[PDB]
């Protein structure tokens, strides 16, 4: 193909909500329910400030987990423990086995695979995943966060791939928008079985049955 490579050759997976469960937003919704807080209250506090908010600064590696905790508690006030809510949920994270198996099968079939995720520095599971993927890109290690355009350029430069050769799976639609704009294939992971059927369709690799 002189001009354009439309056959997929790389598969990029988000971590929380895709390769590992649960994602934080569900965590917070179920916490609102359990504590009888107004719905969306914790998820609003979590995202307060947008690109300048405490959570983006944590994902970018600008601040550490210990610095973030009292900022999140302040956002909540703007008697539960943020430290406990997050430590309990993070301790209970589990690999999404059907998703991991699909990633391994794509790699066996010659795909370059990568993890691209927003994550945090804990100043107080990844080793396993690392050996089974070609690349691991963590927001707080590179100093960039999804959905900033930059980190998608970094991903493509790391893969040495054009956007049309890449399929990207994420639980968050905002994170797929820049990839879809660049011409990547995108899959929104709301339910793992539907996402795998869609991944089978676009790659032509059997992943189900
Ligand atoms: O989907 C995204 O792009 C996204 C964006 C911003 C934050 C996060 C985010 N996820 C987590 C997270 C992942 C798994 C678990 Cl089980 C939990 Cl409890 C949290 C934390 C996070 C934020 C502050 C402290 C620790 C983690 O931050 C994820
Ligand atoms: Mg996610």
From Swiss-Prot:
Post-translational modification comment from the UniProt entry: The N-terminus is blocked. The covalent modification of cysteine by 15-deoxy-Delta12,14-prostaglandin-J2 is autocatalytic and reversible. It may occur as an alternative to other cysteine modifications, such as S-nitrosylation and S-palmitoylation.
Variant or mutagenesis effect after changing residue 14 to A: Loss of phosphatase activity
Residues that, per the record, bind phosphate: 117-118
Record PTM N6-succinyllysine, positions in chain: 60
Subcellular location: Cytoplasm; Peroxisome
Known outcome of mutating residue 97 to C: Decreased phosphatase activity; no effect on epoxyde hydrolase activity
Span list, region Phosphatase: 7-209
Self-association state and partner proteins as the record states: Homodimer.
Entry note about domains: The N-terminal domain has phosphatase activity. The C-terminal domain has epoxide hydrolase activity.
Summary of the function given for this chain in its UniProt record: Bifunctional enzyme. The C-terminal domain has epoxide hydrolase activity and acts on epoxides (alkene oxides, oxiranes) and arene oxides. Plays a role in xenobiotic metabolism by degrading potentially toxic epoxides. Also determines steady-state levels of physiological mediators.
Protein name: Bifunctional epoxide hydrolase 2
Organism: Homo sapiens
Shown stretch of the complete protein: 2 to 223 of 555
